[PDB]
Write a protein that binds this ligand. Sequence first.
Ligand SMILES: CP(=O)(O)N[C@H](CCC(=O)O)C(=O)O
Ligand SMILES: [Zn+2]
Ligand SMILES: [Zn+2]
Length: 474
Amino acid sequence: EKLDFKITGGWIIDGTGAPRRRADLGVRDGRIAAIGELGAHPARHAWDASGKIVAPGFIDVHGHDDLMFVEKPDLRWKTSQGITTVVVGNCGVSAAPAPLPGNTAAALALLGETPLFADVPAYFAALDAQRPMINVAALVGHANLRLAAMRDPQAAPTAAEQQAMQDMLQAALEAGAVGFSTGLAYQPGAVAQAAELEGLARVAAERRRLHTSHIRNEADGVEAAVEEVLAIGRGTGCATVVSHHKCMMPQNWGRSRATLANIDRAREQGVEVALDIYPYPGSSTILIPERAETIDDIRITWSTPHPECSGEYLADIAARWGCDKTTAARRLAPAGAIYFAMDEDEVKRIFQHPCCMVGSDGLPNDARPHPRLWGSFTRVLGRYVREARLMTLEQAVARMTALPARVFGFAERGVLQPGAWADVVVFDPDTVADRATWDEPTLASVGIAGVLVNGAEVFPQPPADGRPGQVLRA
Ligand SMILES: CP(=O)(O)N[C@H](CCC(=O)O)C(=O)O
Ligand SMILES: [Zn+2]
Ligand SMILES: [Zn+2]
């Protein structure tokens, strides 16, 4: 039978870590039909990958694009960097379930202004009706759970409220969620104690689902914070992921030696533990006034009362207004910012850990976003692999494909093998690179030649109508 698509003349890096090999790839009915010599095989569509690498589409394990499938459906910031699948609902905040009327959280604003969904089934129904550009897997946020179950989300939960959150989690998992996420460094999640988190972890563990976590503190208390979530995994057996692992502030640079060692002790004991990073020494989230006097070069990404301040340094704003930086930050609220507080050499060492995946952590709603939104994966390929030689291209591709699929349980994805879904990316290994900078954070990558999602082209030319992305129901 005629192939729907064929990619010939290139070198395949299938995600297994095996050395690249010269071979063609054929696609039929959304899946990889064959791999080998297809030069003379008839195909409806054909791509010449001569001089390029043909690999599995990249899986962004740390997305916050929950509401973008309806707000900004193009998802060009993903496809332009080779991403074919994204895991949303991270750091305790997700599209569903909806908070109780009146209950809110600063971190939720980062997802966008679209009213949140009632529950996971409602969210997935919306995605089924308006198919996403790329595949979407979803985690349920602990913040959402607390905001949906507690009339006072700043209190300790009653036995009934704890059970309510567990029941909501169970429902979400039955609906297809891949697990739940926590944002322990943010309200209301920070209020949670071990019993509350372990209770939710037991529900996920029972169904072989995940607990991805933005730990309690990533600065002075980073080691204890890692220990806290590892203790949960150890005691419940729940597969765990340490989100955007890092060490903030000069006095904490180098502590990854200790945190990674603890992570190793945990996985040696049988607990499934992984982590992810974005390739930059600056973080980005809501503007936190308490940081105004401890971190220099805080750059505003957005501000509701002062939208003219996006892209400006807090110090320059405060100087102009004639007030101290803390006062200026309070006047900018609600707002978001970028914090340059990590050691890039350490970021690289963390990425080298065998269980580290790539998570862009892009904030698509930001007026002047952190460039990781558009350049994370290509920065890894161009700067971490080609420029720094932190690992081979074959190893890096595995971290972006097969590893994520294994950690999140995505059957028939993350690898180029017959029968698997045809999520494919074709790129030039010598030119692939990010172009997004701190000043111009939305510049598209170079070196990405084409991207297929379930066998359909999404890059460089997006589909005219219905998009190829699928909801990855666990
Ligand atoms: C929305 P988020 O929780 O994924 N952003 C974190 C903030 C880390 C920090 O500065 O506390 C980051 O950029 O790593
Ligand atoms: Zn986070
Ligand atoms: Zn996040």
